[PDB]
Design an enzyme around this catalytic site. Structure first.
Site, mmCIF file in Angstrom:
data_model
loop_
_atom_site.group_PDB
_atom_site.id
_atom_site.type_symbol
_atom_site.label_atom_id
_atom_site.label_comp_id
_atom_site.label_asym_id
_atom_site.label_seq_id
_atom_site.Cartn_x
_atom_site.Cartn_y
_atom_site.Cartn_z
ATOM 1 N N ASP A 110 -9.816 24.324 -6.406
ATOM 2 C CA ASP A 110 -10.824 23.972 -5.412
ATOM 3 C C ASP A 110 -10.553 22.562 -4.900
ATOM 4 O O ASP A 110 -10.629 21.591 -5.659
ATOM 5 C CB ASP A 110 -12.234 24.057 -6.003
ATOM 6 C CG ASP A 110 -13.323 23.755 -4.982
ATOM 7 O OD1 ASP A 110 -13.581 24.596 -4.153
ATOM 8 O OD2 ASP A 110 -13.886 22.689 -5.043
ATOM 9 N N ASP A 123 -22.042 30.235 -1.046
ATOM 10 C CA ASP A 123 -20.965 30.309 -0.066
ATOM 11 C C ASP A 123 -21.306 31.300 1.040
ATOM 12 O O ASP A 123 -21.064 31.034 2.224
ATOM 13 C CB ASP A 123 -19.651 30.715 -0.738
ATOM 14 C CG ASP A 123 -19.063 29.608 -1.605
ATOM 15 O OD1 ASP A 123 -19.536 28.501 -1.521
ATOM 16 O OD2 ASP A 123 -18.147 29.883 -2.343
ATOM 17 N N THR A 159 -12.826 23.090 3.091
ATOM 18 C CA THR A 159 -12.790 21.731 2.564
ATOM 19 C C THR A 159 -11.381 21.298 2.186
ATOM 20 O O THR A 159 -11.095 20.097 2.171
ATOM 21 C CB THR A 159 -13.713 21.594 1.338
ATOM 22 O OG1 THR A 159 -13.299 22.516 0.320
ATOM 23 C CG2 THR A 159 -15.156 21.882 1.721
#
Lengths: 517, 521, 528
Positions: B53, B389, B86
């Site tokens: 992530d 999400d 991101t």
């Protein structure tokens, strides 16, 4: 060997160099901030946790310390420019550094005594200041042109700021805020409110003097024929002329019975306030439940925690008196207005005034995404409003974009045609400093300053004294057609401050330190 | 030749800035895509963490350089505004910084680069928006399919047929067909151990994680309730300063107990005088939330008590219920109370959670709470993240309606068009825009490499197929090649691509404008 | 005890070392000698940055353990207290004499023979100086007032005050006259106080012939002014160090109540004592009340109702200024207040100065005063501080002109005349002393040469011209171009120094040179 106790000492060769190197070190802090295309400086404190980026020359000079005792002199002078005038901070700091930078060469290479340089700069300064006057044009007549000039000034004064993104809107908002005054130049009549949510382009001008706090717990949402009495007094458990009586009981019920006594004394005090004949009561201090209910029962609309700035602004709008003491119904000024209404701006409560006393006031309402954005927007408006406000007393302007600077340096170079020998190079040095600003402007904009400045000079020299830098296209343009103007008063301040600022350090050739503590 | 001596060297700072920033981006780059490589970090506590992530990695990379840290803030802005991409916003930043570095070496002033890139970003957004597939909030199934797609990459995908419409309905309960900005912080995801993944509920008023009252005499349920939010503690007088109580017999103990009980009684009576029916007490360890002695009085008053409510729950309550906090029992009055049709505690598979429904208060705002259930911690944690999400996906669709194909397709479409269009520009405009467009391909290039595909082959196929084809073509890791990614249901909201173009411009603009670093002490 | 860790110098080497130490001090302050002298940056122990060219301030801020340099500082202290003009010149000249002594010692002239020769040379220098003196106070009073102002105007030109010095020169003239009676012609400097505030410009400065308080009134509703009241006996002022209320402590009260009967009386006592104290003001017959302390709310209302304006929290010196100016007393208590203690003035009022919120309170006699205050304004602290100190220098000049009417022309002209006289007499000695007499004259030359160098002028061409004009044309004083005027010849330029100033400058610098030359051993211990 004299002195001792680990003091700093510098003699002619060292202190003289330090005076100039110091001033240059100051210039290096802000030389990048000049012009709408200036570069940013990253500032970070010892904690590392306050890292910020700004191109505000004043912030940088105030934020970044220098250890050179001569640099501290120029920084302090730049502070005065920023606080007292509101603009020109970078321009004065640059011109001061460049005037002193050339002075260093004049001593070391041209064999010029510091006293000769000072007098030469004084003569050149008179030429520069006269050049500003002769080139200065007003539109005092034809109000249409004056209002337009303010808009052109506004767009220039907003340059380099966050508001430069949407200057087409803020130029009119700032201009209208000043045009609304039709009166005093004091910026305390103009309020800025910072609200989160929306974009900067969504800012509004509202002439109703918007208040950040509402009134009442359970009181009407609109006050008609409001009569305003401001307070700075303690109303909470006020023991009136019974001081020294304490509550000591053996039950809760008895204590509550004694607390009534405080209510009776507060009731008398609140009644004396009501004897004024008021509809709205504002206290800088907090109002506890007892005096709050006492105001409500008598029909008085209660505002608490009206801080210093609030009270002072109310004095300029409603015309009331802070009245810290309410022992007599007279000897107080009471304000008034037609309406006080609870209004929502961006889903945030405010009050809106109408019919205030001789209203010159207005509010500019900012709509931003972040606190940092709004904080820069607020200061940017303050700076622009100051110059725009001052313009209403000094209506003459000159052309910007380096035009005024070339016109000034042209006069200074002319002055050097009729000058004694020793002072001749000092006068020319003054001109060379003046032309550094259009050089920095071009360099920061990413253009070839050597071409633009040299060609611009030839334009202003061979008449055509309307031309200046086009810092968006990278060429030379007519500043009157582009609308690039700067306040005459500000240009006088910039030249005056830069000239004197140099003289202060030009007169220094020794640094003497006392025992440190 | 002979040129600028460059005695004063401001470029040395910009070079250090670019080198530091690009290093961060390249570190994140290798984790792009479902086939990306993992990062391992040893934290300051000695713990070993492994994740792909980007945002989580960036926070733990502990970047030092003042300017390189700004790439972490970029990922935070993406997470705040879009909630997706991101990793891609930093990667594009790195590649665009590389374009700036080359342009600087080519003799383009940093000021020219920053402004020219901004102009390219403006056109990039227009190209992106025109090519998207439009959506409508009126099409519930379409919203479910959008959420279902983002859910297909989660650990437990077999319940996506439930989590998708839950995210859809949760937004629609608070956002109708005509809405621009939906703040999904008003959709509270509340976890409780027990039950199963599909066993979820959408509650209007609130879902709390805590029980109400278990002791004898408690009402355990109240209809038509007024509710207050307590930040103070209800306990016998217990000062912090020096104090002593002397008890030599049960007779003095009785006196002392009456003093402690009478104190709490007066508080409880005032709460009753305020006509408050339910007390919701903010968690604190300073003093007892509500002491047992107070519970005996409050129970006799038919007042419900819920203790140890987290700050985040209290903040939600202040919006859903229409009620206000009370800082102290002194100010505890009716004006600070809300309303509710029913306040009850639900015991389903041992849940024992207090919830409020039927607020019907003018102070209430369009909020909703979701009940997340599951046996293992991994189930309720994965479900919460999956719904979060999915809510971010829908929020994106409201802000800027439509989805674009994934697999790097919009980066090939934008880059391909910009490279051709830039040829019609003049001066630095064309030279800079060619470097801007080229930088965009870092995404489809990285996706190809992380997928195990030949880097040049895939990008070559993407260029050719987009010239003859359309946005729908792109990289599919599931097909291990360049195919019709739209038909493969590989879709991202428009906002993700739009925001990435904006952030990349803003970050590079900010970095290039920094010509020095100074300390303020 | 502890003979070690000490420094010592003695003998022929000490003579060179000591003179070089004196040279080091002169090499700093010499750069500020002249109306165009350069400024110093003076850094305080706390890092405060100030700029000045005041040699007295610079030498005071120079903190050194060199004992020979300390002797030079002592010289500048004597001149600063006695005359207030030559604080730089006496040290520069004393160094110049020591520099000459160095060569004289090296040539074989005994330090004592140098000291004796310099003393006799100083006597010749003063003997000639007298021949060039003239009177300012002589003849028509109008000429005195003209020259007195012009002397102040010149003395101000060396500081930032020079911009608008016309007003400050007038302040010095009025200040020295206002505290001096024509017959006695004695000036007591302590009767002229300096005061100033940040704000406005230096052109706004003025001389106030009364007392100014930097304090506001005890209550915003209280009248701001008292007038003579239609021919009554002016304004009566009550000046005390105690507030007109039952005093209450700021720490502990320790007031024990033994009964309810006392409790009720005690609460009443305070309320009644507030009344009694204000009533005592009316019994005294006072119009205004000035206390070291402020007032409680009850006292403010009682003073308000009875039309008794009062000023709060007035400092010690401020209370004395009123008592002195108003020919009254400071009364510790209230029972002694009467016509025999209360002060008298003609008006007390609050004055606003543009946008400056100080709102000072001014007490005026509206007649000849015993004391004045010089009020200085300016756009910053350093501007006010320097312009205010500029008045100090000008006040010293006009002080000396009143006391001793004999003056000589400056600009270094006096030093050139004295140098020429000593030089001509040196050749008449025919003996050993000739070396010291010539040296003394050469030391004097260093002053007009310093004035040249600090002005950007060639000191060799300048001194040659100075001596040539006073030999070829007329001994009459010829000055230097340091002021940037069209020409020299100070007779038309009004650059004038008092005789007593120049006389002391030469004699004291010579005495200091001897003070150092006679030192043949220095022993320095530690600092506890």
């Amino acid at each position: 060997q004299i002195f001792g106790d680990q003091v700093t000492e510098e003699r002619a060769e060292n202190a003289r160099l330090s005076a100039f190197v110091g001033a240059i070190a100051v210039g290096d802090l802000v030389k990048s901030t000049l012009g709408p295309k200036g570069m940013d400086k990253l500032l970070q404190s010892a904690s590392s946790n306050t890292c910020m980026v700004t191109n505000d020359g004043a912030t940088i000079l105030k934020s970044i310390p220098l250890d050179n005792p001569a640099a501290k002199v120029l920084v302090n002078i730049s502070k005065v420019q920023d606080d007292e005038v509101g603009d020109g901070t970078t321009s004065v700091t640059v011109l001061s550094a460049e005037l002193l930078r050339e002075a260093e060469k004049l001593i070391d290479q041209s064999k010029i005594h510091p006293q000769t340089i000072i007098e030469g700069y004084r003569l050149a300064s008179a030429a520069a200041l006269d050049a500003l006057t002769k080139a200065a044009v007003d539109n005092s007549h034809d109000k249409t042109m004056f209002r337009e000039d303010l808009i052109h000034i506004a767009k220039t004064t907003l340059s380099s700021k966050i508001l430069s993104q949407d200057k087409d809107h803020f130029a009119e908002l700032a201009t209208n805020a000043i045009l609304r005054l039709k009166g005093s130049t004091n910026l305390e009549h103009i309020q800025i409110i910072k609200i989160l949510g929306g974009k900067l382009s969504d800012s509004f001008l509202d002439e109703g003097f918007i208040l950040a706090k509402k009134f009442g717990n359970n009181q009407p949402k609109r006050i008609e024929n409001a009569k305003i009495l401001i307070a700075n007094t303690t109303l909470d458990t006020d023991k009136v002329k019974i001081f020294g009586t304490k509550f000591k009981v053996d039950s809760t019920a008895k204590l509550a019975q004694l607390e009534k006594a405080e209510r009776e004394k507060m009731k008398n005090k609140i009644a004396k306030i009501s004897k004024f004949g008021i509809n709205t009561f504002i206290n800088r201090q907090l109002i506890y439940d007892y005096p709050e209910q006492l105001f409500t029962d008598l029909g008085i609309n209660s505002i608490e925690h009206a801080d210093f700035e609030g009270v002072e602004r109310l004095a300029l709008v409603t015309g009331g008196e802070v009245v810290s003491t309410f022992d007599e119904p007279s000897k107080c000024k009471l304000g008034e207005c037609d309406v006080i209404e609870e209004i929502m701006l961006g889903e945030q409560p405010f009050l809106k005034f109408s019919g205030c006393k001789a209203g010159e006031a207005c509010t500019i309402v900012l709509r931003g995404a972040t606190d940092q954005t709004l904080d820069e927007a607020e200061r940017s408006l303050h700076d622009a409003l100051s110059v725009l406000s001052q313009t209403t007393k000094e209506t003459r302007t000159v052309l910007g974009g380096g035009c005024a600077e070339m016109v000034m340096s042209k006069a200074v170079d002319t002055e050097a045609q009729n000058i004694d020998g020793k002072k001749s190079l000092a006068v020319e040095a003054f001109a060379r400093a003046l032309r550094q600003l259009p050089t920095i402007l071009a360099d920061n904009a990413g253009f070839d300053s050597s071409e633009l400045v040299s060609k611009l000079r030839s334009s202003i020299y061979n008449g055509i004294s309307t031309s200046g830098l086009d810092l968006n296209n990278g060429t030379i343009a007519d500043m009157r057609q582009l609308g690039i103007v700067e306040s005459y008063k500000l240009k006088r301040a910039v030249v005056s401050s830069a000239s004197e600022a140099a003289e202060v350090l030009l007169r220094v050739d020794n640094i003497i330190r006392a025992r440190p503590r | 030749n002979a040129t600028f001596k460059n005695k004063e060297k401001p470029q040395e700072v910009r070079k250090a800035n670019i080198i530091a920033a690009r290093s961060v981006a390249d570190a994140i780059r290798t984790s792009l895509g479902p086939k990306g490589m993992d990062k391992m970090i040893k934290t300051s506590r000695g713990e070993i963490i492994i994740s792909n992530d980007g945002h989580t990695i960036l926070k733990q990379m502990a970047i030092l350089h003042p300017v390189a840290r700004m790439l972490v803030e970029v990922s935070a802005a993406q997470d705040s505004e879009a909630g997706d991409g991101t990793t891609s916003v930093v990667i594009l930043t790195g590649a665009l910084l590389g374009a700036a570095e080359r342009l600087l070496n080519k003799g383009i002033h940093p000021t020219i680069i920053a402004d020219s890139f901004q102009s390219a970003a403006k056109r990039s957004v227009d190209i992106l928006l025109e090519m998207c597939h439009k959506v409508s909030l009126s099409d519930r199934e379409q919203l479910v399919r959008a959420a279902s797609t983002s859910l297909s990459s989660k650990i437990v995908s077999q319940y996506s047929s439930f989590l998708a419409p839950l995210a859809v309905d949760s937004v629609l309960k608070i956002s109708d067909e005509n809405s621009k900005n939906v703040d999904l912080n008003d959709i509270r995801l509340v976890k409780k151990v027990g039950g199963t993944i599909d066993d979820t509920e959408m509650i209007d008023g609130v879902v709390l994680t805590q029980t109400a009252i278990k002791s004898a005499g408690g009402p355990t349920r109240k209809e038509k309730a007024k509710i207050g939010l307590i930040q103070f503690q209800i306990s016998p007088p217990k000062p912090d300063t020096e104090n002593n109580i002397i008890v030599n017999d049960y007779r003095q103990m009785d006196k002392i107990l009456k003093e402690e009980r009478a104190y709490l009684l007066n508080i409880c009576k005032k709460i009753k005088k305020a006509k408050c029916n339910v007390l919701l007490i903010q968690k604190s360890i300073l003093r007892d939330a509500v002491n047992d002695l107070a519970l005996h009085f409050l129970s006799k008053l038919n007042i419900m008590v819920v203790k140890d409510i987290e700050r985040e729950e209290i903040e939600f309550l202040s919006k859903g219920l229409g009620c206000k906090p009370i800082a102290d029992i002194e100010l505890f009055t009716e004006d600070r109370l809300g309303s509710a049709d029913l306040v009850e505690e639900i015991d389903s598979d041992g849940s024992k959670i207090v919830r409020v429904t039927g607020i019907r208060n003018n102070n209430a705002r369009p909020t909703v709470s979701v009940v997340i259930r599951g046996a293992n911690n991994m189930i309720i944690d994965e479900t919460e993240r999956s719904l979060h999400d999915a809510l971010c996906v829908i929020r994106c669709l409201v802000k800027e309606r439509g989805l674009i194909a994934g697999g790097g397709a919009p980066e090939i479409e934008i880059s391909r068009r910009l490279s051709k269009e830039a040829r019609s520009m003049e001066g630095v405009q064309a030279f800079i825009w060619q470097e801007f467009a080229s930088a965009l391909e870092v995404i489809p290039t990285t996706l190809a490499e992380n997928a195990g595909l030949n880097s040049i082959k895939v990008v070559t196929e993407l260029r050719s197929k987009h010239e003859n084809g359309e946005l729908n073509d792109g990289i599919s890791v599931r097909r291990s090649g360049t195919t019709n990614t739209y038909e493969e249901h590989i879709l991202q909201p428009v906002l993700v691509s739009t925001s990435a173009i904006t952030l990349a411009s803003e970050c590079v603009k900010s970095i290039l404008r920094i010509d020095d670093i100074a300390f303020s002490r | 005890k502890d003979q070690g860790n000490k420094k010592r110098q003695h003998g022929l080497e000490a003579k060179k070392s000591h003179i070089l130490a004196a040279r080091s001090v002169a090499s700093i302050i010499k750069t500020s000698l002249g109306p165009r002298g350069l400024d110093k940056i003076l850094i305080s122990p706390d890092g405060e940055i100030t700029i000045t060219n005041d040699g007295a301030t610079i030498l005071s801020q120079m903190e050194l353990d060199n004992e020979i340099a300390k002797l030079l500082v002592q010289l500048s202290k004597s001149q600063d207290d006695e005359i207030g003009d030559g604080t730089t010149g006496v040290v520069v000249l004393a160094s110049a004499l020591l520099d000459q002594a160095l060569e004289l010692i090296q040539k074989g002239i005994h330090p004592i023979k140098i000291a004796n020769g310099f003393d006799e040379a100083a006597k010749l220098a003063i003997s000639k100086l007298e021949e060039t003196c003239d009177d300012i106070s002589a003849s028509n009073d109008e000429l005195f007032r003209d020259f007195l102002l012009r002397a102040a105007k010149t003395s101000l030109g060396s500081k930032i005050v020079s911009k608008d010095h016309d007003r400050f020169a007038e302040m010095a003239v009025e200040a020295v006259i206002n505290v001096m009676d024509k017959d006695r012609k004695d000036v007591d400097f302590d009767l002229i106080k300096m005061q100033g505030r940040v704000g406005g410009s230096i052109s706004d400065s003025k001389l106030i012939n009364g007392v100014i308080l930097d304090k506001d009134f005890s209550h915003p509703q209280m009248p701001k002014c008292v007038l003579p009241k239609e021919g009554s006996d002016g304004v009566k002022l009550a000046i005390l160090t105690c507030p007109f209320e039952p005093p209450k402590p700021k720490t502990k009260h320790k007031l024990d109540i033994s009964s309810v009967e006392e409790y009720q009386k005690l609460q009443t006592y305070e309320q009644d004592k507030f009344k009694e104290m204000i009533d005592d003001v009316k019994k005294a017959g006072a119009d205004v009340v000035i206390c070291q302390w402020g007032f409680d709310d009850e006292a403010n209302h009682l003073l308000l109702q009875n039309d008794l304006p009062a000023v709060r929290w007035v400092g010690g010196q401020e209370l004395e200024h009123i008592a002195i100016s108003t020919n009254g007393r400071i009364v510790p208590r209230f029972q002694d207040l009467s016509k025999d203690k209360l002060g008298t003035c003609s008006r007390i009022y609050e004055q606003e100065f543009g946008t400056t919120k100080d709102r000072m309170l001014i007490i005026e006699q509206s007649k000849e005063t015993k004391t004045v205050t010089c009020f200085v304004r300016g756009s910053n602290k350093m501007i006010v501080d320097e312009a205010e100190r500029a008045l100090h220098d000008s006040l010293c000049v006009v002080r000396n002109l009143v006391k001793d009417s004999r003056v000589v022309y400056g600009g270094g002209a006096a030093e050139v005349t004295m140098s020429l006289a000593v030089s001509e007499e040196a050749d008449k000695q025919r003996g050993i002393d000739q070396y010291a007499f010539r040296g003394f004259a050469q030391a004097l030359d260093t002053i007009p040469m310093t004035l040249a160098e600090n002005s950007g002028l060639d000191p060799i061409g300048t001194l040659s011209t100075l001596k040539s004009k006073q030999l070829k044309e007329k001994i009459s004083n010829i000055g230097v171009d340091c002021l940037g005027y069209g020409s020299n010849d100070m007779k038309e330029l009004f650059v004038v120094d008092p005789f007593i100033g120049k006389k002391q400058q030469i004699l004291l610098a010579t005495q200091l040179c001897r003070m150092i030359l006679k030192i043949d051993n220095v022993i320095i211990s530690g600092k506890d």
